[PDB]
Symmetry: D3
């Protein structure tokens, strides 16, 4: 099982999105795209106590945005995941590019896809072969 195989081309301005643990797999990809000549900005949207690699890719890409959401021990997890789904859709909307990549749970990908859909900019989803 390998990370999402992706093409190494100069797409231009790229928005590398990483939901939850997905940011780990996006780090190297974003890093590479930047090194090849792309102006990529990564976005990590997870729970407050789960932010990771913030420093690493902050030095690897042009701009690294972290949107930490409070892990509410009150409501149930399904509710909490719905907040991330919210923050996630919001951010991507204001941010709006030549390409947008993302690796997170299918549910959040579809949600972000419906967004990016309204602006023509192509998107790439994760793939583990």
């Amino acid at each position: 099982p390998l990370g999402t195989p992706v093409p190494m081309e100069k797409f231009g301005k790229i928005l590398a999105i990483g939901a939850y643990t997905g940011i780990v797999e996006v780090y190297p990809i974003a890093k590479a795209w930047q090194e090849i000549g792309n102006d990529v900005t990564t976005l990590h949207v997870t729970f407050e106590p789960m932010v990771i690699l913030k420093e690493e890719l902050e030095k690897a890409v042009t701009r690294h945005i972290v949107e930490p959401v409070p892990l509410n021990p009150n409501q149930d997890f399904l509710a909490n995941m719905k907040n991330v789904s919210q923050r996630l859709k919001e951010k991507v909307r204001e941010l709006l590019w030549d390409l947008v990549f993302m690796v997170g749970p299918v549910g959040d990908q579809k949600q972000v896809f419906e967004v990016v859909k309204e602006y023509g900019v192509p998107m790439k989803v994760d793939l583990h072969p």
Copy 2:
């Protein structure tokens, strides 16, 4: 648009549907379907204690649903990882399986794959 992991609907036999963290959400319908088609699937959700979800749902959808809740975020992940390896090992160790499907972070699949591989059991990851 993007869709869940496309998977074949056949009678593989005994299947271990593994879901790490949020991945369990995507596995629920798949497991549910496989069970409905005639498979004897057992789902395994390995996440952090305050993140268990759909426990009730698939508990009624499959034959057996195992939840392994785990109490910086880096060492925390290695725990979820160890428990995931440990747990999966015992499964393949205390009974036979036909197919092992998992959806979760690549790192975790790369490791889970290693253990399952040791038993000659075919695996399928979220493609």
Copy 3:
């Protein structure tokens, strides 16, 4: 070895699962699953009269199971007989589409009949998906 057509398990909505000839065997479990997940699938089996199979099985698995048996005319070569199944089957999908709305059309059958069924469904914007 070769596995059945890998397909996503999502709630597409109303799905038309088409099975030409022996293809219906492979579609049975798929349709069954989609229905179980929350889809309103209707299967369509178009084969020769003496080849209808699994009629009872998926009749209980999905909301509606349509069987369109076409006679194997003994006074005609298989090429003709064959072209007849294509015909009927094409009249059926068109009849289905132009009478009810759908979200997805999945069909597993001979490449020949797939290109035909598609020539129609594309006329209604409904997305289609075949085997692999």
Copy 4:
């Protein structure tokens, strides 16, 4: 729209192009081409007696075209009649792989049947490809 099984055009050598039921239609052009490119392909059509088709066409397109017509008993459920085709298929494929050598084998038919043949083929260390 839907296209036939995309396949590479190389000189594999001796190829056994298998077509079960209506699948032979899709294999005809493929076999024809492989032969034209320099391959020594032999096609095998295993269907029901009253369903043999294109026999003359590919008989002129490839080196050897084998037709194995199975009796279609309209008085048995199709599940039975299908077993026969299955059996015959495993028989002839075994009989062929037992006698002569082969560099490649390609098939296009029901998934269930592709599994059966495959398991046999894999016994004689010869690579195989199936439709997609």
Copy 5:
């Protein structure tokens, strides 16, 4: 590791394009398509001293066009290629009679340049793999 797997159907008039060594892999494909009933015309665009299989596919398809470009040894290869990349777009535009399917096997770069030109005429094109 096999040649580009391609469908054997009667698309109609097909333009089989082969850049540089790519023509070797296209030869059998074109040959086959023609044999199946297609009216394919192959195009080989390479450097003058690299034309190959000219006679072979000249007999296999309806029309085989060879566009040889000179090799200037007083500049880097990136430049010489540009000429080849120019002849490509200049020839594909010319041929764009009425076609049903265009197929090409050659350096990715040119595959994109030929794509923009063809995309213009709403003609289906398939690359290699």
Copy 6:
């Protein structure tokens, strides 16, 4: 539209990025990236003498860049000339896979040559991804 070979960005370790003829153009960025991510990649360009390209570029992008230029012989024609490149390919690949260990080998070139190199890499048990 058409894009370069999509490839995973992981730390495989020591990687041999092979580029035959014009294929080296497409491999350059891939190798460059893999190196940047933490891989110890060595690129190999095997083409005709008057076709070497990007030599300077990836020489600075990866740990080691090997160029094996094969002279043209206007007598053998372009048939035995290519097969003359398939020779250098197999041989160099054989020296590398034999004098060193590699975690993965990647190549982008004419399928014909991809098969050759493959039959060679299979012998030494090394994974290999194609374009």
